[PDB]
């Protein structure tokens, strides 16, 4: 099988600036008919892949002329000029000079933008949950950049890591920020034993008293 290599992440790319994602082939994709059997696909978060470019020089329908590709047989470059926020996603190179079709590992396009602090929101457990024997406290950090952020929980001013689950969104299609949620899950008893619940982003702090 022909092996397609590409990096897992692009260098961070400022909006309005040109991105370049490279891909390398273990055998030449130029056939003796002069055509280079290279394809580019974009996969946007939560969506199936979409063809961008087929056989080097052809644009799929509805794809902007900002997307171009070039390369000498074994080594290629997807160029995206004037990068927009909606271009964010995973770019896959692929071939079918030879069966089977193979794809590259995918390259996540990283958009660079102004630093932004999160808008922070804290959610006490619903009354609904309490009968379950659990109580989940949720911290939501909305629309920040860059991705690396830290959330700390404090119950009655004391730091609690047990029962905490964190998860992020992908980079947003319209503003190029991230959001993330942190959930502190306790028992109904632990939650009712204590009063003050705090989360803090890293210094933005939101809190409530039960």
């Amino acid at each position: 099988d022909i092996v397609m290599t590409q990096a897992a992440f692009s260098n961070p790319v400022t909006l309005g600036t040109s991105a370049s994602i490279s891909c390398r082939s273990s055998k030449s994709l130029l056939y003796s008919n002069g055509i280079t059997y290279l394809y580019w696909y974009l996969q946007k978060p939560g969506q199936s892949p979409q063809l961008l470019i087929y056989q080097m020089s052809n644009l799929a329908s509805g794809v902007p002329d900002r997307f171009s590709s070039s390369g000498s047989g074994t080594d290629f470059t997807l160029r995206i000029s004037r990068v927009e926020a909606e271009d964010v996603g995973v770019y896959y190179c692929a071939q079918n000079l030879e069966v089977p079709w193979t794809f590259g590992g995918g390259t996540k396009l990283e958009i660079k933008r102004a630093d932004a602090a999160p808008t922070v929101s804290i959610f006490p457990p619903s009354s609904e949950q309490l009968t379950s024997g659990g109580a989940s406290v949720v911290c939501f950090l909305n629309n920040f950049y860059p991705k690396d952020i830290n959330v700390k929980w404090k119950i009655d001013g004391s730091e609690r890591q047990n029962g905490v689950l964190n998860s992020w969104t992908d980079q947003d299609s319209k503003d190029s920020t991230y959001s993330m949620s942190s959930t502190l899950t306790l028992t109904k008893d632990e939650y009712e034993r204590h009063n003050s619940y705090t989360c803090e982003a890293t210094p933005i702090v939101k809190s409530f008293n039960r």
Binding site: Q50, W101, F103, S136, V138, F140, S167, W168, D170, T183
Partner: protein, 208 residues
């Protein structure tokens, strides 16, 4: 117009067989090559194989030829993928695709197959109540995926849904929406949670 609706996923125990279907519409399905490609969770793409219009030519990834059988019923406008002797490594989202690498390239939305000896478990769902930000918290489910929409999908701007987290054999996630303070609580906001594997469909009204 052009559609590729997929089904036949869910959970299956190791060693088992499973048959996925891809129902086409909005084109002369009998005149196109069709393909199957899969994507394991958090990973890239693997082409499985393809099949010509009349079914006289069927190509496979060599290492998947024993396990996978691609067929089709043009009279039913349907594509099939039959898997047998399935293993944990076959857990993935399976896409069917029309005529890949050409002007006609189009991919279906995908169906998830999970190979596991564990038990499909329905989610519990809780509202996240205090521009204003609302959410719901979805916990305790297996397997993946769950989908979370707001007002059936009609409310899209401002929605932030984090990736799922696995812990102690079960998944959780949360979806939040930010909405003008003049709109809520004055107007209805609902989150729709589906867990296809357990055939779960539920709605939570977000209320003061």
């Amino acid at each position: 117009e052009v559609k590729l609706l997929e089904s036949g996923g869910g959970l299956v125990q190791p060693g088992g067989s499973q048959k996925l279907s891809c129902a086409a519409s909005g084109f002369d399905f009998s005149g196109y090559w069709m393909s199957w490609v899969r994507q394991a969770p958090g990973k890239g793409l693997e082409w499985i194989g393809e099949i010509n219009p009349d079914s006289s030519t069927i190509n496979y990834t060599p290492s998947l030829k024993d396990k996978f059988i691609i067929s089709r019923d043009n009279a039913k406008n349907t594509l099939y993928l039959q898997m047998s002797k399935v293993r944990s490594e076959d857990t993935a989202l399976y896409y069917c695709a029309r005529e890949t690498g050409t002007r006609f390239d189009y991919w279906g939305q995908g169906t998830t197959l999970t190979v596991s000896s564990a038990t499909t478990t329905a989610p519990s769902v809780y509202p996240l109540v205090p521009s204003v930000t609302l959410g719901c918290l979805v916990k305790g489910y297996f397997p993946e995926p769950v989908t979370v929409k707001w007002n059936y999908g009609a409310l899209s701007s401002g929605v932030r849904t984090v990736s799922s987290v696995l812990q102690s054999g079960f998944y959780s996630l949360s979806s939040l929406v930010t909405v003008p303070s003049s709109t809520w609580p004055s107007q209805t906001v609902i989150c729709n949670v589906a867990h296809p594997a357990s055939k779960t469909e539920l709605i939570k009204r977000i209320e003061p």
